[PDB]
Amino acid sequence: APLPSPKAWDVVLCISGTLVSCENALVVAIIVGTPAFRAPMFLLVGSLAVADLLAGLGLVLHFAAVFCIGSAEMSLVLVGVLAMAFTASIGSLLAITVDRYLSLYNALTYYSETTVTRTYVMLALVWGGALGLGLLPVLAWNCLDGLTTCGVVYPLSKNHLVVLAIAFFMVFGIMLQLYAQICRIVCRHAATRKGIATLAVVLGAFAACWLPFTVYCLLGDAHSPPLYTYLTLLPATYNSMINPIIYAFRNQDVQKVLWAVCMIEETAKKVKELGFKKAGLLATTGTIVSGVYEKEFSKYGVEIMTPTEDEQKDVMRGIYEGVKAGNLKLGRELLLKTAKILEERGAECIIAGCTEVSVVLKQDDLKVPLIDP
Amino acid sequence: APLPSPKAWDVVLCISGTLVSCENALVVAIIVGTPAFRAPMFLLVGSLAVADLLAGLGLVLHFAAVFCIGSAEMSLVLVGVLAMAFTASIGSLLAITVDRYLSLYNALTYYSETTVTRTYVMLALVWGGALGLGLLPVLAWNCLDGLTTCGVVYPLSKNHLVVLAIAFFMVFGIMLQLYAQICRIVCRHAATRKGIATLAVVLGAFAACWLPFTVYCLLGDAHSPPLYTYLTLLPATYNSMINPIIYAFRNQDVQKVLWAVCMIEETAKKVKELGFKKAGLLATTGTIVSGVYEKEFSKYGVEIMTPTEDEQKDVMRGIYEGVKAGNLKLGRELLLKTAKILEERGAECIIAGCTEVSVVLKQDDLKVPLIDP
């Protein structure tokens, strides 16, 4: 009983897995190495790295099993561990994105607490959650009995593959909505092409790398041509190799370690380019309290001025009790007196943080330039 | 060529469709009737109502066509318009929930023209997608022709049903993440039992009535028993009939016109029950500015006092530069002079809006009771 000589696609898969493991070995090594990199966000990156390394090891071991080994059960356990690793990688991506969202959101409500209630509950639910879906394909969902349809990848039952695809589509939807929220929040703290490209390649790469296999899984059949599955399984390993370059090496702290081994932002730009060192502000009380303008304009060395709390309440009325309420005259009067006193105090430019200020106040009403977002 | 006598499941479906149409007719008529009900969020409810009415009309017309008409083209266009209506219904539900979430996210900027543009774009997009995945695919690419291996519902191709199922699962993921966010953000104005029950029941209502079928969409083929299809389609009509009771028919002004035709809430009510009319607050600057605490306690007639701006900055240091920074002594120092001056001014009780205050402040340190969230 000699082992048939594998076709070239087998050695292509072997090379892909080999470079995947080689690429991730260094990243897991450095992640686990330096004692300083024990931040809560680093644990998720480590989880992703070890999951992908496990995937590569499983792939090369399976190729070995199909190369002068001639075994039966080891092939089954290797396909099981491969499914384990892929589900773990998808869970690591979801956990990373949810951590990033919760990080960038908490800087507005100003309420941060706990590290064991949140990080470990989801870190243990991605590897632990994959236990069931990595033990089902071996326990009682095999193809050797004969009753199972054994749809696409031999041996895997139709039901198990369908369940996996449903889970994948669910997590894709959650990821899409999360990225929409993060883009909406980060746009405010900003041109259009750069803003889109900030988060447009990662989601496109994820989709273009993982969609074809699941689409085939749904549409396929047992008697499908054999080259189709081999053609569609490559993007999964390609994403496995791409992901650590884009989610781990981009962080500049690891870059420093290696080198040792080896709408408001643009407004601030415009203000700094005009040579003005002092700006006055008219906006809502929440906006001034939020502290965004001070940090953004201090990043370029520009100082902002907000009137006193009584004139803050005056601007409150002028915007909402004034322009917004239909009493345009009161709004323009209050805004004009506030702008006048601010200009007298030494401001060379005035910023109208909301549209209502621009509605009743124009350039001709001020000696200094009037600039709006 | 006589028409075979339908099975009793057919008249069951007819009864369900008639009830759906009758229930939705009144609500759509009332919504379109009163000129005062032209709010931006009323348009989405109207769209959902018209979609459900269209679905009911399509179902009853299809039963009619399969009864003593014996026509082929009419049945085809009727099943097409049925798919049209169901897709429109699910899209309208998603639009309603996204509108609610954006409305509850920010309250100041919700009432403007921006929400008008958003509403118009959402309505156009949902009905255009209904056009693109409804009548247009069904009046082509069908089964009443050469071999297409049409799937469970006669006549519908396998590929069309798979595409519909994929879209449904993506929409389900979006809905799940939205409801998680809304449940997170409403459990700060809390009592909690009512909110958690609502946000766990209205989700399951749509989750358990539309997913007997989309799973059968995949695990099945033409050579399938006919009992398994006529049973899983009933929950869709049941959800169609249940929908205009949950999202609509629950607000109060609709009730009035019908009759004419026919964690902080808990603390605030606890303080109110104790008989205290005056409370003092220690929390972050953003929290005191945000206007939540005073609004909630004024809902019960309780007055909250916040320290002056200098003492607010002192509390800022005591929380962050103090307890949070590791200099616990400075934090407790600043917090306890703050509590002392507030108590001397007439505070009958003190609230610690952050855990940091409670860490270094205990009940024995003040004469008045100390209450924490």
Side-chain angles (χ1 to χ4, degrees):
Chain A
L3 271 189
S5 313
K7 184 19 53 185
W9 310 108
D10 211 351
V11 61
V12 201
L13 271 202
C14 156
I15 313 319
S16 181
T18 321
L19 292 294
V20 152
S21 295
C22 289
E23 145 81 7
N24 261 28
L26 66 103
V27 66
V28 47
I30 329 182
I31 282 296
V32 82
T34 298
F37 285 170
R38 313 320 171 180
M41 74 68 60
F42 275 122
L43 283 197
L44 267 43
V45 182
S47 93
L48 169 149
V50 58
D52 184 31
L53 177 62
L54 196 132
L57 184 131
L59 207 183
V60 59
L61 258 56
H62 185 285
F63 174 48
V66 84
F67 184 55
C68 38
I69 273 297
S71 84
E73 279 75 21
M74 338 320 274
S75 63
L76 182 63
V77 300
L78 281 167
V79 83
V81 66
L82 214 75
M84 191 46 108
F86 283 159
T87 295
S89 92
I90 220 64
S92 269
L93 267 192
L94 179 55
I96 276 275
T97 201
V98 85
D99 163 78
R100 247 267 293 284
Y101 169 56
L102 262 298
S103 147
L104 289 190
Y105 171 116
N106 205 180
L108 287 186
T109 314
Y110 310 120
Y111 194 87
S112 302
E113 58 184 2
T114 70
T115 196
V116 305
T117 283
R118 179 62 44 73
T119 293
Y120 304 110
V121 70
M122 273 146 210
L123 185 31
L125 218 75
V126 292
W127 280 88
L131 216 61
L133 276 301
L135 84 82
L136 283 202
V138 50
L139 185 136
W141 252 246
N142 45 1
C143 296
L144 278 287
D145 158 89
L147 192 65
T148 36
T149 279
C150 214
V152 190
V153 165
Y154 178 79
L156 286 166
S157 147
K158 185 69 149 285
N159 316 337
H160 184 259
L161 262 188
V162 162
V163 166
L164 256 65
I166 303 317
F168 160 74
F169 277 140
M170 213 87 78
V171 295
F172 194 64
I174 276 161
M175 213 89 58
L176 190 86
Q177 190 304 351
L178 268 171
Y179 254 70
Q181 291 270 249
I182 205 169
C183 206
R184 151 151 290 140
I185 272 282
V186 80
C187 216
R188 179 179 328 320
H189 177 177
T192 288
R193 65 272 164 176
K194 180 181 178 301
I196 294 180
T198 308
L199 320 92
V201 167
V202 315
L203 202 42
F206 183 57
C209 282
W210 262 120
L211 264 179
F213 169 55
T214 59
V215 152
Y216 197 177
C217 185
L218 266 41
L219 256 300
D221 191 281
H223 303 63
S224 181
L227 94 173
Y228 265 20
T229 85
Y230 267 0
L231 199 138
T232 186
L233 208 42
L234 258 281
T237 61
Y238 270 173
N239 164 286
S240 147
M241 149 290 298
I242 271 163
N243 159 303
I245 325 188
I246 164 176
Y247 257 114
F249 281 174
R250 299 297 303 272
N251 154 286
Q252 69 169 359
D253 320 60
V254 188
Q255 141 194 19
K256 302 161 211 150
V257 181
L258 262 63
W259 200 218
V261 153
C262 179
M263 168 25 69
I264 298 295
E265 151 47 35
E266 178 304 333
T267 280
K269 284 272 217 40
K270 164 172 321 173
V271 167
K272 188 52 172 302
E273 281 173 57
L274 284 179
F276 296 156
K277 284 196 178 186
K278 148 37 52 177
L281 167 61
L282 330 172
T284 64
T285 38
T287 41
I288 39 184
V289 168
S290 65
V292 285
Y293 272 16
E294 313 64 352
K295 27 194 86 54
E296 291 309 312
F297 285 131
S298 67
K299 286 179 184 177
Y300 291 91
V302 189
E303 166 189 290
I304 87 186
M305 185 25 49
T306 58
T308 67
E309 84 316 341
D310 197 67
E311 331 162 272
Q312 299 311 149
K313 185 254 293 179
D314 279 3
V315 167
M316 202 36 268
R317 320 143 85 193
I319 291 171
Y320 282 80
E321 191 195 352
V323 186
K324 199 175 192 64
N327 197 344
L328 294 169
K329 176 189 174 185
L330 175 67
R332 52 198 59 170
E333 149 208 2
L334 294 180
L335 290 180
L336 80 87
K337 39 175 38 72
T338 299
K340 138 63 203 83
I341 167 60
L342 278 194
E343 196 180 41
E344 188 170 282
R345 284 177 189 166
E348 49 267 37
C349 71
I350 302 298
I351 304 165
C354 198
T355 317
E356 274 72 34
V357 182
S358 304
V359 164
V360 297
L361 192 66
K362 315 301 173 176
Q363 182 50 76
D364 58 346
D365 295 307
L366 304 166
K367 320 166 189 290
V368 297
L370 188 152
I371 323 159
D372 46 359
Chain B
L3 271 192
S5 67
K7 188 42 66 191
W9 296 310
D10 213 353
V11 61
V12 174
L13 261 201
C14 161
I15 287 303
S16 181
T18 319
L19 267 284
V20 152
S21 293
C22 289
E23 141 82 5
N24 235 46
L26 69 97
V27 55
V28 73
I30 301 178
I31 285 296
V32 79
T34 296
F37 285 169
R38 313 330 181 171
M41 80 57 65
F42 278 157
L43 284 195
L44 276 66
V45 182
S47 95
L48 172 141
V50 86
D52 185 28
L53 179 61
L54 196 165
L57 184 131
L59 196 32
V60 62
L61 258 57
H62 181 282
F63 182 121
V66 81
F67 183 73
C68 79
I69 330 303
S71 69
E73 279 73 21
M74 322 332 269
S75 65
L76 200 77
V77 285
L78 279 168
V79 75
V81 66
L82 212 71
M84 181 46 108
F86 283 153
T87 283
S89 161
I90 166 161
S92 204
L93 197 137
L94 162 72
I96 274 189
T97 193
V98 75
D99 153 32
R100 182 139 161 285
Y101 161 71
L102 249 64
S103 166
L104 213 60
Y105 173 84
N106 67 74
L108 298 100
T109 70
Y110 167 66
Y111 283 106
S112 291
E113 57 98 18
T114 316
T115 179
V116 170
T117 86
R118 266 292 183 180
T119 293
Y120 280 166
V121 165
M122 281 315 148
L123 263 278
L125 205 51
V126 297
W127 273 99
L131 264 296
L133 291 200
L135 264 277
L136 164 154
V138 73
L139 273 191
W141 197 9
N142 38 308
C143 176
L144 262 285
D145 47 8
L147 294 324
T148 81
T149 78
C150 47
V152 196
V153 180
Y154 183 45
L156 286 189
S157 173
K158 182 70 150 285
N159 327 321
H160 192 23
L161 267 191
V162 170
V163 165
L164 251 55
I166 293 179
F168 161 72
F169 278 125
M170 299 256 200
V171 155
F172 195 73
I174 295 317
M175 218 81 43
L176 206 144
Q177 204 303 329
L178 263 291
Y179 257 103
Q181 289 263 45
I182 203 164
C183 189
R184 146 86 54 74
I185 213 185
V186 299
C187 260
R188 245 173 247 276
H189 296 7
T192 315
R193 173 252 169 188
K194 171 188 176 303
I196 192 173
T198 290
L199 310 167
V201 166
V202 317
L203 170 68
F206 158 98
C209 302
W210 252 118
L211 177 83
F213 183 89
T214 85
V215 201
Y216 201 2
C217 183
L218 317 180
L219 319 152
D221 88 2
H223 309 71
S224 186
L227 165 61
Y228 267 154
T229 289
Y230 254 48
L231 165 66
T232 176
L233 212 45
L234 255 286
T237 59
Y238 274 172
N239 164 287
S240 147
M241 104 174 308
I242 278 174
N243 164 351
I245 292 199
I246 282 198
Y247 279 99
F249 229 69
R250 281 232 323 265
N251 81 27
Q252 298 215 355
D253 42 42
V254 167
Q255 175 67 51
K256 311 166 197 182
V257 285
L258 278 150
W259 180 210
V261 167
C262 301
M263 104 164 52
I264 298 315
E265 187 23 45
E266 189 23 43
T267 292
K269 74 210 317 182
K270 164 172 311 163
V271 170
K272 185 50 175 302
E273 296 162 85
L274 197 56
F276 284 165
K277 284 196 179 184
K278 147 48 51 179
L281 164 60
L282 329 172
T284 62
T285 303
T287 42
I288 45 191
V289 166
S290 63
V292 286
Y293 266 14
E294 327 79 336
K295 142 209 303 185
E296 293 305 316
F297 277 69
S298 66
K299 288 182 181 179
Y300 284 91
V302 193
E303 167 186 298
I304 313 319
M305 180 23 47
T306 57
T308 72
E309 59 310 341
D310 198 66
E311 331 159 308
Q312 302 294 1
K313 187 254 296 176
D314 282 4
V315 168
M316 171 36 78
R317 316 146 85 184
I319 289 168
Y320 292 91
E321 192 195 353
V323 186
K324 198 175 191 63
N327 197 344
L328 298 169
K329 174 189 173 185
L330 176 65
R332 48 181 70 94
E333 140 176 321
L334 294 181
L335 289 175
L336 58 60
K337 349 305 177 202
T338 298
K340 141 55 52 182
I341 167 60
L342 277 194
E343 194 181 41
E344 186 171 283
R345 285 175 189 166
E348 315 141 15
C349 74
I350 303 299
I351 305 163
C354 301
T355 58
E356 284 76 35
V357 179
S358 44
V359 159
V360 296
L361 194 64
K362 298 308 152 282
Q363 179 46 76
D364 59 347
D365 292 307
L366 300 168
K367 321 165 192 291
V368 296
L370 283 72
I371 319 164
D372 45 359

